[PDB]
Each structure stands twice: as structure tokens, then as C-alpha cells.
Amino acid sequence: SRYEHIPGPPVLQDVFLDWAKKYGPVVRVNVFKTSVIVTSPESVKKFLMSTKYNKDSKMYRALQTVFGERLFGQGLVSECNYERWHKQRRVIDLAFSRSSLVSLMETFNEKAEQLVEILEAKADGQTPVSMQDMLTYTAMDILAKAAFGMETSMLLGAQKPLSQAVKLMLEGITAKRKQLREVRESIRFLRQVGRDWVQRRREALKRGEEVPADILTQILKAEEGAQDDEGLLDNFVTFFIAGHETSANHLAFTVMELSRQPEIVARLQAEVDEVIGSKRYLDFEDLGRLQYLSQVLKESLRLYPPAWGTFRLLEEETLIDGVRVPGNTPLLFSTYVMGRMDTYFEDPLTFNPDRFGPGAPKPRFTYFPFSLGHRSCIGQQFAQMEVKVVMAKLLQRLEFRLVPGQRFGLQEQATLKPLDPVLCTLRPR
Numbered sequence: 001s002r003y004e005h006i007p008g009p010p011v012l013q014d015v016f017l018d019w020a021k022k023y024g025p026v027v028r029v030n031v032f033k034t035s036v037i038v039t040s041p042e043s044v045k046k047f048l049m050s051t052k053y054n055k056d057s058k059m060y061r062a063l064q065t066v067f068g069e070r071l072f073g074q075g076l077v078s079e080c081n082y083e084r085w086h087k088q089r090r091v092i093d094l095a096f097s098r099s100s101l102v103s104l105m106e107t108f109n110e111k112a113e114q115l116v117e118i119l120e121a122k123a124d125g126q127t128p129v130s131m132q133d134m135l136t137y138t139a140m141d142i143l144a145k146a147a148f149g150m151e152t153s154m155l156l157g158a159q160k161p162l163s164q165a166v167k168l169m170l171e172g173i174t175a176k177r178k179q180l181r182e183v184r185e186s187i188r189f190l191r192q193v194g195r196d197w198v199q200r201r202r203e204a205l206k207r208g209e210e211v212p213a214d215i216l217t218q219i220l221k222a223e224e225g226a227q228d229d230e231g232l233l234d235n236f237v238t239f240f241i242a243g244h245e246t247s248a249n250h251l252a253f254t255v256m257e258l259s260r261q262p263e264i265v266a267r268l269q270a271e272v273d274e275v276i277g278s279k280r281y282l283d284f285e286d287l288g289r290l291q292y293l294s295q296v297l298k299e300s301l302r303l304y305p306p307a308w309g310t311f312r313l314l315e316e317e318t319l320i321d322g323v324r325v326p327g328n329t330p331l332l333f334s335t336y337v338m339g340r341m342d343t344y345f346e347d348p349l350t351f352n353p354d355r356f357g358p359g360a361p362k363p364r365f366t367y368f369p370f371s372l373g374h375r376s377c378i379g380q381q382f383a384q385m386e387v388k389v390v391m392a393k394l395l396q397r398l399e400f401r402l403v404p405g406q407r408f409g410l411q412e413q414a415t416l417k418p419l420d421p422v423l424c425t426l427r428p429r
């Protein structure tokens, strides 16, 4: 092989972790084609903080199409041509301005209040409750309203077919005749929903309804001269999926881990008590004052990044950390791997929020749960605000105990998520 000379072996992220440990900062692997996992901070900096390095489209191909069905296609995540990317990124950026996000505070509050009232009613310390499912309904209900102006009402038990579609498509990215059929139909369903909600927005505008400027406004604008709506739909599916799935799992992971950290939980309860009190509504400014909750969520992303990493195309032969890496090679970056290396993090398996305390030295290119550079998460602040609002309201009102038997392990599709449904029993504070 042109790759035989590179060090390497003569959940998949965990295998990568073991190999990076065993073999060093530049290791050859198999994802889908041969790629090279690069785990030095210097390398992270060089490749992610430069606009000379583009994503590798061959590696995103499994998000563009699934069993011949267009999924993310040429939307904002999976578009690897720089110009095309840059054009749509800059247009859609408008929906994530400071004042756009601040105005979502009402939506975040309402959906979080609804979740908490639903959980309070079950808080008999006996009824098992899937926090993964409940957090996913909350994130979807937030996204639909926030990004598209629609009310899915999943918290109320609506949109079960839609829930099913999502589940089946996620399984499909990582994979008979029958599962093949369930997958295709699901992807087509979600694009059909896209055509549905797009039609409504356009009717509204035509009939001159009040039209909140949101993410949907901006993805419409991005496509002013397209001959068809394929680009538009690509972005619909992208935001629909990216905008809830990882938020949901970040919340779920946080709740799962916190269930064996009672001292940390008591600290979080104290913080929430002291800043917001008994208030039902968190002000934008309150978010800033929840400093310890903010550290907890960061540490949760260190050990449990739902978006595990990214790929860049190495265009020409380059020496990386003493290793010759051939022209035309997918470079694999993983915040999951790096977060669990003792050479980057002291006692890496210890959940310690103090790593992110003010005055603690900041991780320097060893932690990137939203990636870094020009292709970093456009929804970073949106996600941070929403998960802070959900967590703060849970902590205000409820105590959680993981049902015994629930595992701490992971499953890996395209993203990482709890292996188990995070079944908990609950009591009011």
C-alpha cells in the first residue's frame, strides 16, 4: 500500500483511541477507504485553523446520500467546495446573530417549562422515564419552532411517524431488503416534510402573514437563482437533523453522567437556586451567571462529544509529526480521542468541571466539540443557550436517579449517543 509505511495495526472511536495511544499522533485506519487519524495539537491547529484545507467530500459521502436517497446532499455541513460553502454560510450567519439568538429565549423557556411540567407529574420516585427520549422531544420541539416556525408538539406525543423516520435514517448511515426500504422511505419522508413546511412559509408570505425572520428565511434567500429546490431541501434536512440531534444527546449524556455525581449536582442546584431563584423564566443575562453549569457542560463535551470530529483533505504529500503522509489523503480529527488521552488530559476518565474553571489553563487545540476554524459549528451559541436553559430548569425543579441496570456506554452512528435510553426515576426538589 501507499499507506503501509505509516504506523498502525499490522465503539469505533474507542478503537481509534487505543490505536492513537499504541501508535502515536499519526495512525492509518479504515473508515468506510483508508484515512489517517491525527492527534497532535500542532496538527489540529495547522489543519483546522487554515482556509487552505477543505473538508474531504469522499468522507462526507455517507451523509450526502444514503442507499441512493439524497440526505444532507450539498447543504452547509456536507458541501466541500469552498466558494459554494462560503456563499451559503455568510447568508445563513444572519439567523445566528446576537439579536436573533436573544429573541429565541422565549422559545427555549416555553419548551423547557413544558418538559419540566411533564416530568414533575411523573416525579413519584418509581415511574421509569427515558430522559433520552424526553430530551430529544424537547430539542426537536425547540428546533421546529425556532428554526422553521412550526409546532411539532412531540412533548405532547405528536409526530411519532416523524420520530420513527429520524430513528430509521440514523441507523441507515452506519449500515436486509426490508431495512433497505424503511431507510429510503424515511429519508424521502423527511424531504417531503421539508417541501411541506416550505410551501406553508411561501403561502404565508404570499398571503402576508407575520413571518418571523428565522433560519428558514435565510436558507430560502441562499437559493435565489437555483433551477430547483434541491439545495434548499438539503439545508432543510441538514438543519432539521443537526439542530436537534446533538443537542438532545449532549443533554442526555450530561444527565446520565450527573446521576453518579451527587456532589456536583448539589453544587449545580445551589448555583441555580442563587441566580434564578424560584423564577420560571431565565433572562438572557442569567445565562452568563451560571458559570459552574457552564463548566459542567464543557466537561460533558470533553468525555461525551456527540459530534466526534471532522475530516480535511490533505492535497499534497506532507510531513506530519515526523510521518510522511501521501497526497490525496483524508485526515481524521477526533475530539473524542484527544479528550481521553492522558497526554492531553490528566486522569482523562475523571469527570472534573474544574478543568474549565476561570484561571485553569485553557485546552490548547485538544478540545473541539464544535470543531474549530471556518467550518466550526454555526449553531454553537444556539446549542449552548438552549442546553443551558433546559439543564437549569431541570436542576431548579427535579431530582434524578438512574434506574439501576442503565449502562454508561456509548453507541456510534454518525454521532455518539447513550447506548441506553437514560431511564431515570424522579422526585421534586
Ligand code: HEM
Binding pocket: 076, 077, 089, 238, 239, 242, 243, 244, 246, 247, 250, 305, 306, 307, 308, 309, 310, 311, 368, 369, 370, 371, 374, 375, 376, 377, 378, 379, 380, 382, 383
Ligand atoms: C451540542 C450541540 C452541537 C454540537 C456538539 C455540534 C457540533 C458540530 C461540529 C463538530 C461541527 C463541524 C462538523 C464537521 O466538520 O463536519 C458542526 C457544524 C455544524 N453544525 Fe453543529 N453542533 C451542535 C448543534 C448544532 C445546532 C443547534 C445547529 C443548528 C441550529 C447546528 C448546525 C451545524 C451546521 C449547519 C454545521 C456546518 C456549518 C459549516 O460548515 O459552516 N449544530 N457542529
Ligand SMILES: Cc1ccc(-c2ccncc2)c(C(=O)N2CCC(O)(Cc3ccccc3)CC2)c1
Binding pocket: 059, 060, 062, 063, 077, 170, 173, 241, 242, 243, 245, 246, 306, 307, 308, 309, 310, 311, 377, 414, 415
Ligand atoms: C447524522 C448527523 C446528525 C447531526 C450532525 C450534526 C450535528 C450538529 N452539527 C452538525 C452536524 C451530523 C454531522 O453532520 N456531523 C458532522 C460530522 C461528524 O462529526 C463526524 C462524521 C463525519 C462524516 C461522516 C460521519 C461522521 C458527525 C456529526 C450528522
